[PDB]
Design a protein around this ligand. Structure first.
Ligand code: HEM
Length: 127
């Protein structure tokens, strides 16, 4: 079924995005990566992140994740600890919204699958 049906309805989708967004902005270890990023881009990012975790995207693959984040890994020290914190905030958001365990596991499997793309050892020319 649709993404919004899985997650409790359209209202719940936007609520989940807000929970997840606020967790990132309120985490002192992650907020600096969002400095200077306009809010429309950020809200769109969170929506696509959520859609991707549940296989609701169609034109977004690992290579797109790398091309979208490579500058942070190379020029801003983005690393696996940051990835694991973002991923933890995401599943915490799902739990806080009353999302069940089967959907949590599915999202976790996706996130674990793309974690290796945030390994800085895979990139050259870093700070
Ligand atoms: C599963 C891992 C991730 C996925 C699927 C994902 C998804 C996305 C998407 C879809 C965008 C496009 C935003 C847009 O143009 O509207 C984006 C950009 C961005 N992501 Fe992620 N993200 C992930 C991990 C992370 C992590 C760990 C961070 C650390 C803070 C992060 C920070 C950012 C930033 C700062 C941008 C904007 C870059 C810019 O526009 O200059 N992302 N991400």
């Amino acid at each position: 079924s649709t993404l919004h049906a899985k997650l409790g309805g359209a209202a719940a989708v936007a609520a989940t995005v807000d929970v997840f967004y606020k967790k990132l902005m309120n985490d002192p270890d992650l907020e600096p990566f969002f400095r200077g990023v306009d809010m429309v881009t950020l809200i769109a990012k969170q929506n696509r992140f959520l859609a991707y975790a549940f296989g609701a995207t169609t034109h977004y693959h690992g290579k797109d994740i790398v091309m979208g984040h490579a500058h942070l890994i190379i020029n801003r020290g983005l690393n696996l600890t940051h990835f694991d914190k973002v991923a933890g905030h995401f599943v915490d958001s799902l739990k806080e919204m009353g999302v069940g365990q089967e959907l949590i596991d599915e999202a976790a499997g996706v996130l674990i699958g793309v974690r290796p793309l945030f390994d800085p050892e895979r990139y050259k020319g870093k700070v």
